[PDB]
C-alpha cells in the first residue's frame, strides 16, 4: 500500500501516510413517528347501506395517514383494477386528497366503470375521466342487498338529454322529453321517467346481483400533501455506529444516551459547527447524542526495503480498543512494534515524544532522548581553564536560486 501511494518500488526509511481507517456500519435503522390518524377506509368499504349509482356517495379524505393495506382484509373482489398507478407501490407515494365514490350497480355493468368505456351506467349516472389515475374496486353484495320480495330502493338513471362530464352528479327527477310533445309532468307517450328501480332478488344469477363498486381517485394539487402512506420503523442500537433516519434526519453514527434535556417543540440539535449532535427518538421521549466511532488515519512506519521488509502500522488520533504488539500512545496507537524502556536517539518521528527504529530484529518504539547527562560542579572558588585547541570545519549548505520556469 505504501508503494502504491508513493508510486515507487524502493521506499525509504520513515513514516508514510497511505489511507484512512473507516468503520463501516453493520445495520441501518429508520425511526418515524407513530401512525395514529388512520383514514376512514373501513367506514367506506364496510358501511351499513350504500347509495344509488346516480347519487354515488362521495367522501373526501385528507389530513390522515392512509393505510392502503387495510383494503385487503376481505378478498373475493374480482375488479381490483388500478389505472395509472400500481397496486403494490401505493404506499410509496403521497397525495393531497383522496376522493372515494361508492355506488351499487348490476353485475354486467361493472366493466362500464372504467375510463373510455361507455354504456348505460357511465354515460348518465357516473362517468370517469379519461386520464383517471386511481383504483376501482368491485365486489358482490348479494347477501346484504337482496330481498326475496325485491329491493326496489336502489334507483338508476336511464334516459337523459346529453352525457355527463367527468365527476358530475345529476339528481333531477324531471320527465324525459323524448319527442316534440311538451310533457306536463305526466308519464306516457314520449314522456318517460328517467329514474328506474332495480329488482334485486336472491334468485338472480351472477350478472344481475347487486355489486358494490368503490372508486378511489387521488388528487395531487400544488397544495402541500397531507395524506402519506404508513411509515415503517425499526429497533434502536447502542454502542455501534449505524445508519439512523430519524424523521428525515439521515446520518451515520453511534446513538448514545445523554442528559441533554430538549424543549417540547424541537426534535434535534446542532453544535457550534452546525453539525448535528443530538436528536430525539420519534417513539420514546429520550434524547440521543450522535458520536462518530473509530475514525482516523493509518500510517506505515517502514525502515525501507534496503534493510528489511517488516513494517508497523499506526492509527493516528483514535483509540485502538476496537478494530504485533498493541501499545497506546498520546499521539495515536501503533501495532507491529514493541515499546522499549531505554531512551535512544530518535530516528523515525511518530509523535508525543515516541520514535521508532530497527534495533537489530523488529521495529522498536522508545521515548526519544534529548541528549546525555552532565552536571558540572558549581563552586564560587573553582574554574575550568582550557589547555588545548582544536581547529574544526563546519558545513552550512544554503540554496540561492531556483529553476526558472514559464508556461
Amino acid at each position: 500500500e505504501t508503494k502504491c501511494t508513493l508510486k515507487s518500488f524502493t521506499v525509504e526509511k520513515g513514516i508514510y501516510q497511505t489511507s484512512n481507517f473507516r468503520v463501516q456500519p453493520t445495520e441501518s435503522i429508520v425511526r418515524f413517528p407513530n401512525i395514529t390518524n388512520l383514514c376512514p377506509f373501513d367506514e367506506v368499504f364496510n358501511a351499513t347501506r350504500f347509495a344509488s349509482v346516480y347519487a354515488w356517495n362521495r367522501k373526501r379524505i385528507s389530513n390522515c395517514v392512509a393505510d392502503y393495506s387495510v383494503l385487503y382484509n376481505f378478498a373475493p373482489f374480482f375488479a381490483f383494477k388500478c389505472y395509472g398507478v400500481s397496486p403494490t407501490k401505493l404506499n410509496d407515494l403521497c397525495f393531497t386528497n383522496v376522493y372515494a365514490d361508492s355506488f351499487v350497480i348490476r353485475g354486467n355493468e361493472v366493466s362500464q366503470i372504467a375510463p373510455g368505456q361507455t354504456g348505460n351506467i357511465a354515460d348518465y349516472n357516473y362517468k370517469l375521466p379519461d386520464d383517471f389515475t386511481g383504483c376501482v374496486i368491485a365486489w358482490n353484495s348479494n347477501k346484504l342487498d337482496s330481498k326475496v320480495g325485491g329491493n326496489y330502493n336502489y334507483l338508476y338513471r336511464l334516459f337523459r338529454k346529453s352525457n355527463l362530464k367527468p365527476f358530475e352528479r345529476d339528481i333531477s327527477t324531471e320527465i324525459y322529453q323524448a319527442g316534440n310533445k311538451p310533457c306536463n309532468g305526466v308519464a306516457g307517450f314520449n314522456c318517460y321517467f328517467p329514474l328506474r328501480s332495480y329488482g334485486f332478488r336472491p334468485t338472480y344469477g351472477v350478472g344481475h346481483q347487486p355489486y358494490r363498486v368503490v372508486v378511489l381517485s387521488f388528487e395531487l394539487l400544488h397544495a402541500p400533501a397531507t395524506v402519506c402512506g404508513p411509515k415503517k420503523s425499526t429497533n434502536l442500537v447502542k454502542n455501534k455506529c449505524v445508519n439512523f433516519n430519524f424523521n428525515g434526519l439521515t446520518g451515520t453514527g453511534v446513538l448514545t444516551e445523554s442528559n441533554k434535556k430538549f424543549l417540547p417543540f424541537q426534535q434535534f440539535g446542532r453544535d457550534i459547527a452546525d453539525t448535528t449532535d443530538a436528536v430525539r427518538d420519534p417513539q420514546t421521549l429520550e434524547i440521543l447524542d450522535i458520536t462518530p466511532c473509530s475514525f482516523g488515519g493509518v500510517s506505515v512506519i517502514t525502515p525501507g526495503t534496503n534493510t528489511s521488509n517488516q513494517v508497523a502500522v499506526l492509527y493516528q488520533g483514535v483509540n485502538c480498543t476496537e478494530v504485533s504488539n498493541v501499545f497506546q500512545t498520546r499521539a495515536g496507537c501503533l501495532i507491529g512494534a514493541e515499546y522499549v524502556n531505554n531512551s535512544y536517539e530518535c530516528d523515525i518521528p511518530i509523535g508525543a515524544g515516541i520514535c521508532a527504529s530497527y534495533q537489530t530484529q523488529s521495529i522498536i518504539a522508545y521515548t526519544m532522548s534529548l541528549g546525555a547527562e552532565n552536571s558540572v560542579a558549581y563552586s564560587n572558588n573553582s574554574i575550568a581553564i582550557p589547555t588545548n585547541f582544536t581547529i574544526s570545519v563546519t558545513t552550512e549548505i544554503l540554496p540561492v536560486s531556483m529553476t526558472k520556469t514559464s508556461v
Partner: protein, 317 residues
C-alpha cells in the same frame, strides 16, 4: 482528507472526485510538509544544546535568586513558576479534519529550557561553543560587564546592590506580565487564527454552493441520477476551492511561522548562548544575559539590561 471532506459516505462521489485528478495527492503532501516543518522548527531553538545540564543542589550562586526560573520540585510537571504562569494564561471529530500533536511535548521542551538555563547560569557561554567550563556567577557577571566596556570593579564592589536589583526585577516581572492581559498576544493570535480557520472550513459544508442542498443524500434521494450529477459537481467544486484556499492560507501562515521560528532561534543562539554587541537584538539597551522560558506554542526571552542613570554634567577635553 478529500475522500471524506468533499464526499460524505458516497462511493459514486469518490469515483467522480478521483476523475478530477490528483489535487488531494499534492494537498495532503503539502500538509505533511507543513507538519514536518513545524516539527523541525521546534528543534532549531530548543535543541541547540547537546547534553542536558543540571543545577547544583546548593541554591546559592553568590547573592542572586533564580527560584522563579528554575523548575519547582513540588509541582509534578518540571516547570518554573514563570512557565506555570505562562502556561495557565494561554487559552488553547469532524468530517475529515484531524489534528496531529507535536513530537516534543510540553515536558521535553521544559527539560531543554532547564538545560539551557543551567548552561547559561553555571557555565556562562562556554556551553554553546564547546565543552562546558565551570565558573562562578559573579565572575560571569564581571565578564559580561567587561565585555561591554564597564570595568569589573563596579561589580566586585557593588555586588549586593546588583543582586538586590536583579531580585527585584525578577519579582516584578511576574506582576508586570500578569497586569496586562494582552501580554501573551503573539501566542494566542496564532491559536485563534487556526481555530477560526478550522471552524470556518467545517462550517462551510452547510453552504449550498448554488445547489439545492448541502448534503449529498438529500440531492441523490430527491432527484434523478442524470439530473443529480451536476448538483453534486457544484458542491465538489465548491469544497475543492474552499480546501485549496485553506491550504494556501496554511502555507502562508507556515512560512510566517518558519520565519518567526528562525528569528527566535537566532535570538536564542545570540542572546542566551552568549552575549552579543547588538543594540536591540537582545533587549533594549546594554545586554548582559538572557533566560529562556517555554510556552505551549513559543518561547519567552527575559533579557537582563544594564542601564545608566543619575548622570551629571562635567567638562570634557
Amino acid at each position: 482528507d478529500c475522500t471524506m471532506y468533499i464526499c460524505g459516505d458516497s462511493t459514486e462521489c469518490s469515483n467522480l472526485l478521483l476523475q478530477y485528478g490528483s489535487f488531494c495527492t499534492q494537498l495532503k503532501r503539502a500538509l505533511t510538509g507543513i507538519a514536518v516543518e513545524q516539527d523541525k522548527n521546534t528543534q532549531e531553538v530548543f535543541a541547540q544544546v547537546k547534553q542536558i545540564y543540571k543545577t547544583p543542589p546548593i541554591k546559592y550562586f553568590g547573592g542572586f535568586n533564580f527560584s522563579q526560573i528554575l523548575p519547582d520540585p513540588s509541582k509534578p510537571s518540571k516547570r518554573s513558576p514563570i512557565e506555570d504562569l505562562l502556561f495557565n494564561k494561554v487559552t488553547l471529530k469532524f468530517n475529515g479534519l484531524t489534528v496531529l500533536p507535536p513530537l516534543l511535548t510540553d515536558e521535553m521542551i521544559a527539560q531543554y529550557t532547564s538545560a539551557l538555563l543551567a548552561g547559561t547560569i553555571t557555565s556562562g557561554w562556554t556551553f554553546g561553543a564547546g565543552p562546558a567550563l565551570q565558573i562562578p556567577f559573579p565572575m560571569q557577571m564581571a565578564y559580561r560587564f567587561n565585555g561591554i566596556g564597564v570595568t569589573q570593579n563596579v561589580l566586585y564592589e557593588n555586588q549586593k546592590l546588583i543582586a538586590n536589583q536583579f531580585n527585584s526585577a525578577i519579582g516584578k516581572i511576574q506582576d508586570s506580565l500578569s497586569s496586562t492581559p494582552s501580554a501573551l498576544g503573539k501566542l494566542q493570535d496564532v491559536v485563534n487564527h487556526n481555530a477560526q480557520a478550522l471552524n470556518t472550513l467545517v462550517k462551510q459544508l452547510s453552504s449550498k454552493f448554488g445547489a439545492i442542498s448541502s448534503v449529498l443524500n438529500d440531492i441523490l434521494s430527491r432527484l434523478d441520477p442524470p439530473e443529480a450529477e451536476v448538483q453534486i459537481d457544484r458542491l465538489i467544486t465548491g469544497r475543492l476551492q474552499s480546501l485549496q484556499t485553506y491550504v494556501t492560507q496554511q502555507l502562508i501562515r507556515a512560512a510566517e511561522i518558519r520565519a518567526s521560528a528562525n528569528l527566535a532561534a537566532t535570538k536564542m543562539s545570540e542572546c542566551v548562548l552568549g552575549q552579543s554587541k547588538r543594540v536591540d537584538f537582545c533587549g533594549k539597551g546594554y545586554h548582559l544575559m538572557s533566560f529562556p522560558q517555554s510556552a505551549p506554542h513559543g518561547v519567552v526571552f527575559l533579557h537582563v539590561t544594564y542601564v545608566p542613570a543619575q548622570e551629571k554634567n562635567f567638562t570634557t577635553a
